[PDB]
DNA sequence: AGAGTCATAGTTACTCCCGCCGTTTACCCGCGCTTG
DNA sequence: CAAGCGCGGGTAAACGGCGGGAGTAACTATGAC
RNA sequence: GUAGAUCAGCUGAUCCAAUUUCGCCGGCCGGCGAUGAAA
């Protein structure tokens, strides 16, 4: 009987039909569930607004009633008789009376600075005065870009290609210069707002200790000045402080040091026009360093509002996203009105009046010196614009707040405070007895309210205060999410028809199915459900870009996975989806590295030291990250944060996170905090192929060629290194996994050794690779001999000594200042403990005596104790032996960079042996 | 030295019906100011 | 001074929120084969 | 024909290879600056 009219399914019971409707047909059923609005209950915010307006009207007039109140409130949406009826309530007049009563009220430092200024000025003066070819040019550009500022290259490669900007200088100068030039006409703040907000240590001379404690990310690009971070680092700190104090006294920076070159960055990976970029400014390095100190000082001096959780000593994005999710979940669960309006200010930093800013700083309480410095800096400030390579015409800026400066996000925090103080005192959401009203991150404002009139009043208040400040509200992204519960039917419903106005301009009302992004996280009207995870496209982009395999691996390690880490941590992802995603990652990495499909799982994801590829496993890393980030929510200083942490939704999320992490981790011994690194480590060494890698952990330097020194080796040899390191060479034994139904020809050596053909056998024991082994030994001994000579010693390679026992061939003998060392070199299979092999090699040299005295006499020193036994022992997979490492770095002094390279030689020699075997396979 | 699709249970996000008391406001009833 | 209009008390008859109860379509993990 | 090689039908595509362009100091040859995305 019961049959749907859109999916054409007949269900046994009306319950089935309705539940099917709620999923298969969201929009139409949501419209059907819109409640009638005959006699809506009087929410508290309506009562507060009514009482306040009645009180002010009585104070200015003396008498009031519904007739004039209606005129006072045009958009209240209550009938002239409904208002009169509500007027009869006693607590209402009590609040009216309460509000009425409330209304009843050295030469060298200057020399070096001048040298830097002259160099910058000379640079400024100099500056002012086919498909195959396309791909080659792109390769050159990408390599040069990645060599200098990695983040730029990663963002370009993952997102789009072909220059990125793609819009040239035109379409920017025509679209931005007029805005950057126009002077704002903000009248300033009203005295009412100043009073509402009303609810010295700065400028002191900077000291050496504070600047030293002032951290700096030296991995930064220089500005138009041309002063690179290297020389600035080279300057001693005390002279830095001298110049900083000199500037403090002068209250200004040298003219040329303020000039900045504007650059554009896309808000969206696929910009549709010139207006979707952020015209950031890169000031000179010394100016940024100088302003960081004041940024920290002002951060410590006057903290922002409690609701302000942007650029502070806390993860504002996490708290805001969690709070929004908790609010939405609570509203859905108990069917309570909640209007959430996401607000953004287009040209946010580039729309604030200079005069309003400086005067507000004056009234707020900063010292006159600081306000005057800001005013002077922004009065004569000027900028240059340059996209791609175009020193455009310089521009004089009429609106301040310079994106990229350390002070700008803090100075704008004053305006943020002012506007945050303007919303009505009693509008918000009562989330677990806590009133939450606004969630601010930088400029992105999210206003919450429990009533339509309350939300409209809040919107109008923020609009007018911004207009007074000079800011203008964007209608492109601003939207209002509204949920009206349906009591007597227990149905959640969303409004559709637009009803909110920013200064007469209607807003876009987000429907139920729409997806909108907040802080870069996808949000649905029902809460964070999932991320579309366009990972296939990103992997295709990375694979198609002109990069060597290690470049792609590093990008996937450090820039792609973290980017979607936020979407997944703040989203709701089922571990099956995570497994599919990590399988996709594994397949892509196997393609890039040309590995087969039988390589052990753990190899990809085990951390660098344990010998893995350090490619983060989403399936396990994500639960760990969400547990770590949501554990501290209960202990956050913010009261609303603690209230959210007690929400049912977050509790369930954390429970599932704990279960997953418990399943994919082992408790650490020392810190007792579960770690995923241990899980992959255990799996890798237990694997048949990785069994020989069990010694990597004890020697961190054994694997330095995977991540730090990956730039000194070509792509091809890196791929070969990875192939042999995990034993990916398709030998017959390794080629018969599951196909051992054949005869001995399927397992014997081709060369005729008649023994089992193991990759170790091919690399070490087969006679055909005899000369290969010798040349590998010669190469490694030559390298270590050259380095050890470079460490001020004596060299006599392969001393020909005929001892009583017979003919013995030591690797190298050494002698310095009367002390000599007998160093032996050899490579050994990893199937046995490397240190026992080291001891076995050392016994037959250091425990003979007669050869010890022979080498002592040859070197010319009589005492035998000065001669010591040592063995350079490295497994053919390139894994170090701990005891050998220690003795080599301690008994004889060698810097670690030299020791970092021995595994490279061992690995290259082993693969050369393999390829030689295959070459003379005949 | 391998990388199981598939059967079944658990679950989540809903559904709907019935009934309960509390809440809101369209009528109704006047009084005071204005105009004929 | 009387009729009319705007300003004010009262009433009750439906809305509205929530409790209680009885199911299920569409995923999402494994326990075992 | 490709910086080189390879597979195709002088053109295309893949690679384990692939530093483009402008200005300069200079003698087709050497060196320099740009070709730098926030906190
Ligand atoms: Zn249907
Ligand atoms: Zn053999």
mmCIF file of C-alpha atoms (C1' of nucleotides) in Angstrom, chain A residues 9 16 19 36 38-39 41 64-65 67 84 87-88 487-488 574-576 663, chain C residues 7-11 13-20 24-26 28-30:
data_model
loop_
_atom_site.group_PDB
_atom_site.id
_atom_site.type_symbol
_atom_site.label_atom_id
_atom_site.label_comp_id
_atom_site.label_asym_id
_atom_site.label_seq_id
_atom_site.Cartn_x
_atom_site.Cartn_y
_atom_site.Cartn_z
ATOM 1 C CA UNK A 9 9.063 2.170 -3.767
ATOM 2 C CA UNK A 16 9.150 2.959 6.441
ATOM 3 C CA UNK A 19 11.998 7.328 7.083
ATOM 4 C CA UNK A 36 2.926 26.866 10.935
ATOM 5 C CA UNK A 38 0.232 31.087 14.300
ATOM 6 C CA UNK A 39 1.150 31.964 17.903
ATOM 7 C CA UNK A 41 6.135 31.243 21.837
ATOM 8 C CA UNK A 64 3.901 54.345 26.003
ATOM 9 C CA UNK A 65 1.649 51.565 24.743
ATOM 10 C CA UNK A 67 0.148 51.787 19.466
ATOM 11 C CA UNK A 84 -0.717 44.326 24.039
ATOM 12 C CA UNK A 87 2.369 43.628 27.780
ATOM 13 C CA UNK A 88 0.131 42.220 30.525
ATOM 14 C CA UNK A 487 6.780 21.106 18.160
ATOM 15 C CA UNK A 488 3.735 18.866 18.255
ATOM 16 C CA UNK A 574 34.026 6.130 8.726
ATOM 17 C CA UNK A 575 37.160 4.009 8.933
ATOM 18 C CA UNK A 576 36.168 2.142 5.769
ATOM 19 C CA UNK A 663 43.115 -0.904 17.891
ATOM 20 C "C1'" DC C 7 -6.064 53.444 24.595
ATOM 21 C "C1'" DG C 8 -6.218 50.205 27.974
ATOM 22 C "C1'" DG C 9 -8.308 45.334 31.543
ATOM 23 C "C1'" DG C 10 -10.360 40.342 31.015
ATOM 24 C "C1'" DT C 11 -11.519 35.489 28.553
ATOM 25 C "C1'" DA C 13 -9.756 27.929 22.518
ATOM 26 C "C1'" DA C 14 -7.010 26.487 19.978
ATOM 27 C "C1'" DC C 15 -1.291 26.148 19.142
ATOM 28 C "C1'" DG C 16 3.003 24.328 20.955
ATOM 29 C "C1'" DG C 17 6.506 21.837 23.550
ATOM 30 C "C1'" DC C 18 7.415 17.433 25.477
ATOM 31 C "C1'" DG C 19 6.567 12.803 27.529
ATOM 32 C "C1'" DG C 20 5.658 8.151 26.321
ATOM 33 C "C1'" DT C 24 12.877 0.813 10.403
ATOM 34 C "C1'" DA C 25 15.843 2.266 5.940
ATOM 35 C "C1'" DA C 26 20.403 2.858 5.273
ATOM 36 C "C1'" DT C 28 29.076 0.434 9.153
ATOM 37 C "C1'" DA C 29 31.846 -2.670 12.081
ATOM 38 C "C1'" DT C 30 32.987 -7.207 13.032
#
